[PDB]
Design a protein around this ligand. Sequence first.
Ligand SMILES: *[C@@H]1O[C@H](CO[C@@H]2O[C@@H](C)[C@@H](O)[C@@H](O)[C@@H]2O)[C@@H](O[C@@H]2O[C@H](CO)[C@@H](O[C@@H]3O[C@H](CO[C@H]4O[C@H](CO)[C@@H](O)[C@H](O)[C@@H]4O[C@@H]4O[C@H](CO)[C@@H](O)[C@H](O)[C@H]4NC(C)=O)[C@@H](O)[C@H](O[C@H]4O[C@H](CO)[C@@H](O)[C@H](O)[C@@H]4O[C@@H]4O[C@H](CO)[C@@H](O)[C@H](O)[C@H]4NC(C)=O)[C@@H]3O)[C@H](O)[C@H]2NC(C)=O)[C@H](O)[C@H]1NC(C)=O
Lengths: 190, 209
Amino acid sequence: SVFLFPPKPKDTLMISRTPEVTCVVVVQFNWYVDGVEVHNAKTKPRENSTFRVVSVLTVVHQDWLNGKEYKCKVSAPIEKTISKTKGQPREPQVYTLPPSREEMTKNQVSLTCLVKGFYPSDIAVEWESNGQPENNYKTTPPMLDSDGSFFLYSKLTVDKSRWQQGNVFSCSVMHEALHNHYTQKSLSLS
Amino acid sequence: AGPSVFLFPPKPKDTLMISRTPEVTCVVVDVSHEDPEVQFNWYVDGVEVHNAKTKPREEQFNSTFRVVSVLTVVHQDWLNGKEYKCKVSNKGLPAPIEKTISKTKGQPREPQVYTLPPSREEMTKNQVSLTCLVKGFYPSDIAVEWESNGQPENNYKTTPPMLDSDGSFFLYSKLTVDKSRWQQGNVFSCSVMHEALHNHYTQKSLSLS
Ligand SMILES: *[C@@H]1O[C@H](CO[C@@H]2O[C@@H](C)[C@@H](O)[C@@H](O)[C@@H]2O)[C@@H](O[C@@H]2O[C@H](CO)[C@@H](O[C@@H]3O[C@H](CO[C@H]4O[C@H](CO)[C@@H](O)[C@H](O)[C@@H]4O[C@@H]4O[C@H](CO)[C@@H](O)[C@H](O)[C@H]4NC(C)=O)[C@@H](O)[C@H](O[C@H]4O[C@H](CO)[C@@H](O)[C@H](O)[C@@H]4O[C@@H]4O[C@H](CO)[C@@H](O)[C@H](O)[C@H]4NC(C)=O)[C@@H]3O)[C@H](O)[C@H]2NC(C)=O)[C@H](O)[C@H]1NC(C)=O
């Protein structure tokens, strides 16, 4: 039983990150990029009541994003192929939404980042404030909208005082269809 | 293997509204032509009941029978965590198949329902987003609806419940409307039904101020 995993969307969209294709078994590994075999992989030695072998292949950001195919050959040998999710790009629209008046009775409040109209669904979202990450968020998986694009929401939970004091919070979105693969929107008390 | 059994719970909305009709559904697929007879026995907290409604077997395209038994449940019984058991008997089985279902367990928490107007920035578009945030709820079983002037809205999508940091769930429901409808002061209403709400129902409305 072989399972081939794609890079995380954020890794492909940030040059500083290292996108990887993972070939998981639950052994000779042969890796192919558009048919052409490559010797780049890092196979770790075979580590409950069963065995597991893992090979990891580092990919070039642009190659992954331009749709090159990545073939893991677990050596009848099981051969598998992966590449970027297909579809014509649609640029995300990003909107920040303050907490409801009625949430102000609570100790913590909800800062909302709506991301809609994007295609395909490979996307990353982060928050920051004052030059540091704000990690107390949950982001919904992308969901198919009625027009065939995706949407999601990210919810940053923040101490109510931090919001009342006027701190500016920022929702950062990364997607292949954005200019520079990045955009940001900010939100503060108004 | 031979025949297999699937047990479906009632819809959350059906359990929460006393006028509606919550049902547990027991489905048997892959019943052979050779041994086509099926018996359902139904149990509520391990006590056999005899009021289920069983339909005659139906021939499928793949030359197998499908047989369905439906048990109507008492709303409060389901909400009070009673266990519903379907036992399926068939001569093609090494032993009868038993399956049990009940409401997700765990301390209930009341959903908080907030409506959020469109971003000012979205106002440059032809269509606008109305957001209903529902958070702090347990269990995840929930129904959410958008309406205007007592009439259902045709363009909305609700995210599946997502686990929050404290073990409760949240979701968002996005309503898309023509910008003019928002501009002309129309009232839009997000209704939520959940076991931990008073009367299992709450509605929150918003309009351009
Ligand atoms: C012969 O044909 C019949 C009929 O085939 C049907 O028509 C033909 C023309 C084709 O198009 C088929 O694709 C089509 O299905 C076949 O019968 C099917 O058999 C399979 C099993 O092999 C059943 O699969 C199960 O499906 C349920 C969900 O079922 C709903 O959704 C279906 C499609 O979306 C729909 O067709 C069904 O009617 C049903 O709809 C629901 O019905 C209820 C009752 O009326 C209703 O109230 C609901 O509102 C309604 N739902 C919707 C969305 O409208 C799925 O949940 C099952 O998944 C479990 O089992 C899998 C293994 O079988 C497993 O991989 C999953 O992970 C999951 O496992 C369970 O997981 C939970 C934890 O979450 C755990 O608690 C359990 O222990 C665990 N394991 C279990 C339960 O074993 C499953 O996929 C089809 O329902 C069934 N179709 C019908 C109509 O009954 C038959 O297989 C064919 N035979 C051959 C040899 O080919």
